[PDB]
């Protein structure tokens, strides 16, 4: 578990691309499991940025 | 979009990694090529519309 920008929800998958997938958290091409995510703007954002 | 812009690109170093890192693009979809390969693959011509 972790937090990302919503634009990066695209990157968390087997065989995917870009700076999160390549450089922060990598899934194998034969992953066996589930990916789950939810918007957390009301929890994790702050009026001065978090 | 009735009369779209066009350019033939030739004779250049095409580092797509700037565009690949700029994932702020709402979509970046490829057909017949995986986008990862574009810095290792190369071409006679490219056309940008």
Short mmCIF file of C-alpha atoms in Angstrom, two decimals:
data_model
loop_
_atom_site.label_atom_id
_atom_site.label_comp_id
_atom_site.label_asym_id
_atom_site.label_seq_id
_atom_site.Cartn_x
_atom_site.Cartn_y
_atom_site.Cartn_z
CA UNK A 1 0.00 0.00 0.00
CA UNK A 2 0.90 3.63 -0.85
CA UNK A 3 -0.48 6.95 -2.28
CA UNK A 4 -0.02 8.31 -5.83
CA UNK A 5 -1.45 11.07 -8.06
CA UNK A 6 -4.65 9.85 -9.86
CA UNK A 7 -2.87 10.18 -13.26
CA UNK A 8 -0.49 7.38 -12.07
CA UNK A 9 -3.33 4.85 -11.32
CA UNK A 10 -2.77 3.99 -15.04
CA UNK A 11 0.87 2.97 -14.30
CA UNK A 12 0.26 0.30 -11.57
CA UNK A 13 -0.21 -2.87 -13.71
CA UNK A 14 1.84 -5.82 -15.13
CA UNK A 15 3.81 -4.64 -18.21
CA UNK A 16 2.95 -0.89 -17.71
CA UNK A 17 5.04 2.27 -18.26
CA UNK A 18 6.25 5.65 -16.87
CA UNK A 19 8.05 7.02 -13.78
CA UNK A 20 6.03 5.26 -11.02
CA UNK A 21 6.11 1.84 -12.75
CA UNK A 22 9.79 2.15 -13.78
CA UNK A 23 11.25 3.97 -10.77
CA UNK A 24 9.01 3.74 -7.64
CA UNK A 25 6.93 0.49 -7.66
CA UNK A 26 7.22 -2.31 -10.30
CA UNK A 27 4.84 -5.26 -10.97
CA UNK A 28 6.08 -8.44 -12.78
CA UNK A 29 4.65 -9.39 -16.23
CA UNK A 30 3.05 -12.55 -14.66
CA UNK A 31 1.55 -10.89 -11.52
CA UNK A 32 -1.15 -12.92 -9.67
CA UNK A 33 -3.32 -10.64 -7.55
CA UNK A 34 -5.64 -7.62 -7.53
CA UNK A 35 -5.03 -3.84 -7.76
CA UNK A 36 -7.39 -1.61 -5.75
CA UNK A 37 -7.44 2.21 -5.52
CA UNK A 38 -9.64 5.10 -4.35
CA UNK A 39 -9.67 8.89 -4.52
CA UNK A 40 -8.31 10.30 -1.24
CA UNK A 41 -8.37 14.09 -1.98
CA UNK A 42 -10.46 14.79 1.18
CA UNK A 43 -8.04 12.65 3.33
CA UNK A 44 -4.57 13.28 1.86
CA UNK A 45 -4.73 16.78 0.28
CA UNK A 46 -4.25 19.93 2.42
CA UNK A 47 -5.11 23.62 1.69
CA UNK A 48 -1.39 24.34 1.60
CA UNK A 49 -0.29 21.26 -0.42
CA UNK A 50 0.46 18.01 1.45
CA UNK B 1 -9.86 19.48 -36.88
CA UNK B 2 -11.51 20.19 -40.30
CA UNK B 3 -8.05 21.19 -41.63
CA UNK B 4 -5.40 19.67 -39.31
CA UNK B 5 -1.71 20.67 -39.22
CA UNK B 6 0.92 18.30 -40.75
CA UNK B 7 4.76 17.97 -40.74
CA UNK B 8 7.16 15.41 -42.26
CA UNK B 9 10.03 14.91 -39.79
CA UNK B 10 13.38 13.52 -41.07
CA UNK B 11 17.12 13.38 -40.24
CA UNK B 12 16.98 13.80 -36.43
CA UNK B 13 17.53 12.26 -32.95
CA UNK B 14 14.03 11.47 -31.64
CA UNK B 15 14.25 11.11 -27.84
CA UNK B 16 10.62 10.25 -26.96
CA UNK B 17 11.57 9.90 -23.24
CA UNK B 18 10.56 13.57 -22.61
CA UNK B 19 7.02 12.71 -23.79
CA UNK B 20 7.08 9.29 -21.99
CA UNK B 21 7.98 11.04 -18.66
CA UNK B 22 5.39 13.84 -19.33
CA UNK B 23 2.51 11.43 -18.40
CA UNK B 24 0.29 14.55 -17.91
CA UNK B 25 -0.92 13.67 -21.44
CA UNK B 26 -4.54 12.45 -20.97
CA UNK B 27 -3.77 9.62 -23.46
CA UNK B 28 -0.67 8.36 -25.35
CA UNK B 29 -1.85 5.25 -27.29
CA UNK B 30 0.19 3.33 -29.91
CA UNK B 31 -0.77 0.81 -32.64
CA UNK B 32 1.70 -1.78 -34.07
CA UNK B 33 4.46 -0.46 -31.69
CA UNK B 34 4.81 -0.59 -27.88
CA UNK B 35 5.76 3.00 -26.80
CA UNK B 36 8.74 1.66 -24.74
CA UNK B 37 10.51 0.65 -28.01
CA UNK B 38 10.53 4.13 -29.67
CA UNK B 39 14.03 5.07 -28.33
CA UNK B 40 15.50 1.71 -29.65
CA UNK B 41 13.51 1.38 -32.92
CA UNK B 42 14.00 3.78 -35.88
CA UNK B 43 12.39 4.99 -39.09
CA UNK B 44 12.78 6.30 -42.67
CA UNK B 45 10.22 9.11 -42.13
CA UNK B 46 7.90 10.28 -39.37
CA UNK B 47 4.78 12.41 -39.94
CA UNK B 48 3.14 14.50 -37.21
CA UNK B 49 -0.50 15.65 -37.63
#
